[PDB]
Symmetry: C6
Subunit: 103 residues, 6 copies
């Protein structure tokens, strides 16, 4: 009941910084971007999956890209190495059929 | 079964809380609520003693998350059945 | 054109305090919880129906439960003894088929 | 028919306003708007003299509600028909 | 690829001031109200179309009506004389079938 | 193709930005995002040199709009294809 793949989630204020973060993340490690969350208050979170070491290196790049985007604000981030299956069942952080082609 | 509900500012800390809760007691995460203003609540069910231990872990995980903040939480030991008929805190699919 | 049953509505900041309020309300009087409103800004309202004397005693318990929830904030409440039918027609405060079994 | 629209912060005060309005004049409540930021607007229609009396009662009910606040209101006597084609202030189902 | 008709868009805080603006606009010039946008934070925008000279006179009336509504706030407005077709394709500012009868 | 994204407070300034961008370079406006808190983002695609010229025009149009404010913007020259599989920045219908 715990997934093999880590989750990393990063949240910005602003849509352009989340795109910056997402692109930097997938260019920095063997990770898949699985989903995004429109959180309200102009905040957005991006969710990535991969082995924890790869998610950590991806997260470092996403953090920098968010902060370096003009007018962007990094709000919060987390890495969970081996998330319980019930988390994946309830939250939109699983692998959907549109990202299979990239994994 | 008891209900525990915990609410954070930010999506990453609600994930952290949820994962910590289900790894700390015999509970089921049944739903989450997008509250607006970048707040999210996670709802768990279990025997009250298990919900309590889970809640303690979830509070700590939310506060320990980079940039995460804990807003509010509750434990209701034996909720009236009318509550889960109206609020999305039941077990069913 | 005025209902036999009062409406009570109570609004909190935070989802956990609204659950606290709702549970305290239905445990304190002969009332039915009919609906909730996601108001934005992390505010939620719960709507109950019953005879006005029962809604008043329920409301007192809901107010206390909201205020006593960790991090919860009570925002606003009302009791309308005999609401006009047009209010029930437009606002989601009627009795739905999922709560018949509890009334 | 005239349109009256009244907006509160909070859901309980919009209920109070709506009920007071329909009990104060020959008007029909046609819709409500969830505006965001916990604001709600109620929309009524009737002859303008009736909408005026109703509006006065609704303003007082909103302000009199525990924790309720009145944000903004308007009365438009004879709205152009293009307005109700776009905004949800018409009578129809 | 640029429309013959200008767009004017006006945004208020509050729903009653947007109704005031919309009504004043269509009473002040040969314009069609095409749509409204629920922007969040209790802000609303109304979108009108017409020849630019007509949209300008309509906009002046909408600005005044918004400001003069009890508790209303004017937030922002624009007039674009000859919008590119790609703007109409992506943003909800075109003529829909419900407003044909008024144009 | 590159992605440019520009976000304003207010709906009128996003229209201004979008129109200025497509009139300043060989770009396609592919989508907009209602972000909440009355913020909106417009997303454009094109060769990066064209997206840059378009972005400059969009920044100026947003700031020049009465009451409009520019919040944030970005240009990504060569986005990874996983980004447009998840975010609504692709070309398709």
């Amino acid at each position: 009941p715990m997934s093999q793949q880590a989750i990393g989630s990063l949240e910005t204020k602003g849509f352009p910084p989340i795109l910056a973060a997402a692109d930097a993340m997938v260019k920095a490690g063997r990770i898949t971007i699985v989903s995004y969350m429109r959180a309200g208050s102009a905040r957005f979170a991006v969710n990535i999956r991969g082995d924890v070491s790869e998610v950590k290196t991806a997260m470092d790049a996403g953090i920098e890209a968010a902060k370096n985007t003009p007018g962007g604000t990094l709000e919060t981030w987390v890495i969970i190495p081996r998330p319980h299956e019930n988390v994946e069942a309830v939250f939109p952080i699983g692998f959907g059929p549109e990202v299979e082609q990239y994994r």
